[PDB]
Symmetry: D2
Subunit: 416 residues, 4 copies
Amino acid sequence: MAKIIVKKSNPLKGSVKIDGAKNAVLPIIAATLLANGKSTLNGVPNLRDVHVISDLLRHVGAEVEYKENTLTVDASNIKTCEAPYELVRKMRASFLVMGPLLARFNSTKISMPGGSAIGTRPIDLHLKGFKALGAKIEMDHGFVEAATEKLVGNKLYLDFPSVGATENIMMAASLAEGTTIIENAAEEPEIVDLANFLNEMGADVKGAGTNTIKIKGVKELKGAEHNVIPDRIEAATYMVAAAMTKGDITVENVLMEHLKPVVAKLREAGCEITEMDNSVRVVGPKVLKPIDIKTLPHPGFPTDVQAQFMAMLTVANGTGVVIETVFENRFMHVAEFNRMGANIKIDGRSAVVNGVDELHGAAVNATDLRAGAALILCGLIAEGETQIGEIYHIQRGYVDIDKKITALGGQIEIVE
Amino acid sequence: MAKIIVKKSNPLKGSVKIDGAKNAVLPIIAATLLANGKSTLNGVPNLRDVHVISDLLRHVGAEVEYKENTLTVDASNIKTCEAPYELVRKMRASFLVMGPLLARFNSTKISMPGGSAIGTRPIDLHLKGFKALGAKIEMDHGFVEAATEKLVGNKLYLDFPSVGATENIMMAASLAEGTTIIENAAEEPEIVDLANFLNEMGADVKGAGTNTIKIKGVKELKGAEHNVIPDRIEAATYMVAAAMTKGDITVENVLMEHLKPVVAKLREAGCEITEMDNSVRVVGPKVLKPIDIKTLPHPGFPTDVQAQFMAMLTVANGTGVVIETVFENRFMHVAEFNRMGANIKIDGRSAVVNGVDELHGAAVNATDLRAGAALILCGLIAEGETQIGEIYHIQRGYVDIDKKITALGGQIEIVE
Amino acid sequence: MAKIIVKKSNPLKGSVKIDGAKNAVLPIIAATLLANGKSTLNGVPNLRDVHVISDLLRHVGAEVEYKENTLTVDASNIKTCEAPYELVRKMRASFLVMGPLLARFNSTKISMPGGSAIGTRPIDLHLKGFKALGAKIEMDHGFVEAATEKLVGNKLYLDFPSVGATENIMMAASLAEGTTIIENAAEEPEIVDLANFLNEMGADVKGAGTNTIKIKGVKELKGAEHNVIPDRIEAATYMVAAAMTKGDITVENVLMEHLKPVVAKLREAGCEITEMDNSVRVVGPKVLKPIDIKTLPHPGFPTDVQAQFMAMLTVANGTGVVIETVFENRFMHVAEFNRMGANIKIDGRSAVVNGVDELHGAAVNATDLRAGAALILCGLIAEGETQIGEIYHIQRGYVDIDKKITALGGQIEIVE
Amino acid sequence: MAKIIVKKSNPLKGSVKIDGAKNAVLPIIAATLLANGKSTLNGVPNLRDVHVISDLLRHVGAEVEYKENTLTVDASNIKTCEAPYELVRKMRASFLVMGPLLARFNSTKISMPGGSAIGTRPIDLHLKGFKALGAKIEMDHGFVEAATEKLVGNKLYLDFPSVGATENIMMAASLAEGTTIIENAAEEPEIVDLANFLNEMGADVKGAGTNTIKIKGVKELKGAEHNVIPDRIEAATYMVAAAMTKGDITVENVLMEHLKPVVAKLREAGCEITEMDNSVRVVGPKVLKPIDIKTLPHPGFPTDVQAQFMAMLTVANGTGVVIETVFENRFMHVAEFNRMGANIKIDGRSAVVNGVDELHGAAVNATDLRAGAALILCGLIAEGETQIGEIYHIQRGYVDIDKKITALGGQIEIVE
Ligand SMILES: C=C(O[C@H]1[C@H](O)[C@@H](CO)O[C@H](OP(=O)(O)OP(=O)(O)OC[C@H]2O[C@@H](n3ccc(=O)[nH]c3=O)[C@H](O)[C@@H]2O)[C@@H]1NC(C)=O)C(=O)O
Ligand SMILES: C=C(O[C@H]1[C@H](O)[C@@H](CO)O[C@H](OP(=O)(O)OP(=O)(O)OC[C@H]2O[C@@H](n3ccc(=O)[nH]c3=O)[C@H](O)[C@@H]2O)[C@@H]1NC(C)=O)C(=O)O
Ligand SMILES: C=C(O[C@H]1[C@H](O)[C@@H](CO)O[C@H](OP(=O)(O)OP(=O)(O)OC[C@H]2O[C@@H](n3ccc(=O)[nH]c3=O)[C@H](O)[C@@H]2O)[C@@H]1NC(C)=O)C(=O)O
Ligand SMILES: C=C(O[C@H]1[C@H](O)[C@@H](CO)O[C@H](OP(=O)(O)OP(=O)(O)OC[C@H]2O[C@@H](n3ccc(=O)[nH]c3=O)[C@H](O)[C@@H]2O)[C@@H]1NC(C)=O)C(=O)O
Ligand code: NA
Ligand code: NA
């Protein structure tokens, strides 16, 4: 089956346009279900996970049309409030329809996400929020059912500033009676994009991007046009590629505000970075300085760039430490980096990376979306040729990574 | 040497006035050193750590006067910029004079804090910030020296949202040339109090209490009058005491905004809590419901109430899990709780508490400030009599815990 | 693709014959490569991993014949000393030919194992041992090459009592010049079986099953007949099944010595166990008592029975804690147990299991060999019907689990 | 109060005689209580912990005489079976009288050890063993009481190969009716010494030093003469000192068998070591090679030499990783090493040591016995002068460390 073949490449040089954020668009597509009427989402990346959640909206009865980076949804006449096992198994962000459906129909039944490549990932905080709003929860043969006679706003506290739980609870609260306060909310940029979209539909959401979000429920929402924010993780991926290849890359169609920790850590590693209004230029250092990273809730260093920064550290001039506080098992890529000649040792949530002279091409498997992209970065600097398998992991969340890297001068090819 | 003797007590009932926040006043006292002139701090708790940092200010040449909860400082004619080993060894918040002194005199030499009861606690992020402002750092025989020809504002990123580093860097940046941005800042309420005080002295600090703080340096600051915020951890301590003793306590002179996670978790445990403008009433449940807590940066659950909530969980109706993400070794109290008949097992950063019928009085030692207070809470509900040793831990950060608990109907006595 | 369908079942009752140990036979098959001549292995389980390593022996030029639980190997005329990427990727115990090949031909090149379902699993200790014997090591594009002018016995210390490293080093040392001492050796029963087989071929291996193994190299080894020990993990799997289903099962063709920790922990959980010469009877309790387990090197509790004991604990009468010290990510099954209604929370290497009334059938995926078998145990007691996917994990290491459970009265079927 | 002053020293050269093992003698002194009659222990180190447990034996009514490294005990006419809070608080090995007293009198009451400098250290496995022998356990106000109508031999499984629990259970089982089997026993050399002493008194203990110990109870034991084994941790401490100071030291009166992992790791670090019958010569390398250590049950690397090897690694030529699997909080020394200019970062149970050019003298505090000795090793190589406080930690478990290091050419002094 399919492989990505990467060869030792030239320093990457030129411009790359960044697509719309996967992780903004998935909850915003779920949010269209809140509205009686038609929404228009612009800047939608052409990704498999977008098509899967589109098919979930079709399954519950919304009218969905995608073309040329615009997705329309008419949720006027939703029929059903069940998310079947196969769709949640394919893509766990499916779970984000639970909030909207519960809010629109007072009842929903959603397959409970199972194992994940990057860890045991419970959805307890989502359900905590729904119960605080007056939903009763029960489990039936792998499904979780939530039903109420009406949602009522309430104060609720998130034990962890969960991105997903913040999204699900915000959407449910938008149509509740009264005022909801989400304490210890996720501050991620995608949370702000979602809130903006809810407000464009007629909601009253304040505080998004802060530690506390206040939602005053409205009786009804209407379809609206929204421009999705740019993919900050894709941007970061190309910024790291510039660092690792000692290249010079302008990343176009980005928001600097959303890239703060990545910019800071790349500068600490030796990069020369120029921040502009809609773009950032990254020039890689001649010698990579070892740095440490610790993944944390935004605006701490993002776990979605952890594997990619680890890959950069494998040829840094010294010892770097990576600490993963957000996910349990997000080190499955380490053994693959080691096949390419890295010197990485893990214990618990920390990985000690001892920089080597260079990596050497080898047959490797992507273990997950961000680690696969990290193996592509390894393959750009590794001597010889790298063959990456299980490439569906990559293809589900990066638009045309082969074409974008090809246009920056790298040697990469998807073969079937 | 001295002991606190606690006996099985009546349910606590009545009102308790909360003192000024230890952890607000210590950085605000350090901040008085920034000003050429005299500051007046009202609501200063009469605590040993206040007197230690006062003596540190005396050592560098400030004029300090304390009386009846007001502290005045005239920092007009500071002489010296060295913090000696004995003062930092006695109280590690001593380290918070480094920022002000560096800013006022362009040079400072500060003993580097050593071991701590609750963990290995580096000060690397403080120094990261100072270097970003143009300070050169070097180590000399246990001291860290930082010197510059002038501080210049800069963007800097905190790998962890460190309370202390946020404080130290904010104070240094207040007199720097140009604009400093602290990304991934601590959002703790004490950070806001400090910023307010800097602004009262003439500074330009915006964003405090958010994830990003922007400081535009000014050439000079002037002494100002400030009212310190109330001690949110002391308040929480009494709120827990109400829960554990099945009492009914009004905590006076508090800010509900600062107590959000404690209020939420006590309500989840079964308490009936009434939030008012300057006070909160806590009525304890008849049966404590087991809850889980996870310590996190504000507004996540505070590590300073972790031991005290653990103590509550030792008689809860089931199994609770405590996860300490902020400090490394903040479980030294567990063996002492176990001497009183708790059923607690730890591995790594998690403690599994299996609720028991009741605790039984025993001879125990406080291991640190918040754990000692937790042993007092255990002793209020434990059968018989509890004798607590190493009480200096407690006395350094609680005002008259014997008198306040005595006025709420508990049986407690300090003996010499 | 294929599924195992398990339904709520009767208590299991009757006898089950245990097959030969997967984990004894794989290193013993690698060890046949040491001998110039023909070996005969009896009690070989008819498992996919046996056929994969057989094909690896074919690839290097040994003559291999399997029939009716006997495998013969003639290693007289080995041709090549390379283990290709596809065979090691399929089955990482492939790596165990490195020791024999290095010893027979003074040179070997072996693909370095990559990611594993249950953790990042380096092979550094294997290479440490080979270097101590005089091998030079280098990496070439995912392969590790080891070559010497002659192996010479030496003292070497294992940082961890690695099963695989102990096996690989013992086999290499059997043909070395002089005496090797392996300090901090694995004491697992499979290590003793291997040593016995080496001695049957003419080796001089003493201390196997103790913390120190002394090998005096011989110039040549000869094929021998060996009876492989019974599969202690398969036995344990059926013993757990008896406990969980409240059944009464005699496990036939086992060695009690190898089952000590499993027998002790099942008795602590409430089982009535009768140890006999070649068999053990397990009668399950009416109420399962919660127990804690901590995985450790033999004779500590085996990590290969961890998932299966976790599954038992999901319906125990209280709270049990599972601590995995041997493998990093061996909790991927937890999310699947949770889909079936378990109440499991993990942090770091510990899992807190809060016993529930009963499990409920659901669609689940095996994540690995021992966890898949654990999902079958869940499905026997879960209400309704459980559908298990990714069943190749199970089928690679259990002989006819459907037929054996069917003969004990359970309802299970493999469908294609 | 008292300090140890160490100055940058010459390479250590000469011979040092090692004393009797603290950790052998403490359980062997407890074991004298088993015998009706008089025991004579030779090679008893003149240590405070020896005098504390001697006073515990006096408290229960044994006749104890110490002189010139011989301790006699007549346990003929024991009166009482209670270990008071003050003696256990002073020295937690006090707990090891519980087994003997329970066995001699069928009843005992022992204060339950509280907090410890190096971790939360439960005694649950001790009690598990006693209950398996027919003892009923209950807690009374910090004491644990264990009583039976008679101890009866039984099989019991240790979840962890606890040194203390193995000792306590072995001593209790020596006078039980029938045969006890301890599965997953501690294999530490001190366990063998104890068993030898029990057998010298008339017991029947086999398997000590293996993973399984079988005790056939006898009705009565008689006082015997015993020669205690040498202190393997003291020996290791001086061996490390040779490595760190680039010296050349013969350690006299040792058993090489007990030092295997320390010898292996020092050789991996670059030392030239010569093993002899009663002694070992260690010559330190010119450049220390970084190594990793992982603490484990014997014969894995001992946790009691972890701090001392960490100290060696602070000036090694590269990055070493220390992993502590045995104790929870055994990193309290790290902040003190950092005051002396080390570069150590911890997360969870792992410490990353990044070797520096040299350490620099500073005021430091011992946190515990083995860490204090490690600070002395730091002070021998640190530039200038090191002042170590809280020296009682050191003095309780090292005989005349000042005099022994002075005789090897180091500059050290205890001042009062
Ligand atoms: C890996 C992905 O990207 C992830 C990204 O890594 C994380 C962190 O920034 O935030 C999103 O996941 P998420 O919403 O599942 O993440 P969070 O809920 O913040 O999870 C972080 C931590 O919270 C825990 N968590 C989350 C929810 C909950 O109810 N309980 C809970 O314990 C998780 O198990 C984890 O330990 C992204 N996904 C989307 C669709 O936005 C992906 O799903 O493809
Ligand atoms: C225990 C105390 O209270 C503490 C309270 O527990 C914590 C957390 O809320 O915030 C203050 O400490 P702090 O400023 O030292 O805490 P933080 O800097 O946030 O430390 C949290 C975490 O960050 C780490 N940290 C901090 C600074 C740094 O340069 N590097 C670093 O790794 C710490 O080791 C720890 O793992 C309080 N002290 C004062 C005077 O405000 C006490 O010092 O008495
Ligand atoms: C899961 C399997 O069964 C496993 C079983 O779980 C373990 C533990 O009992 O022992 C065998 O693996 P193994 O030989 O790879 O296991 P070990 O080497 O003991 O690994 C235990 C620990 O040591 C570590 N380890 C091992 C070798 C090494 O060079 N370095 C290292 O750090 C591992 O990563 C792990 O953390 C079994 N496999 C066979 C074929 O005997 C399987 O491979 O199917
Ligand atoms: C630090 C000391 O030396 C120690 C030495 O570090 C350790 C490890 O080698 O073995 C002796 O302690 P010990 O008998 O208390 O140690 P162990 O019982 O093996 O403890 C190791 C691990 O097992 C745990 N443990 C032990 C007993 C128990 O019932 N439950 C339990 O969980 C401990 O908490 C720890 O995590 C030494 N003490 C003596 C008097 O022999 C000291 O007490 O001064
Ligand atoms: Na844990
Ligand atoms: Na770690």
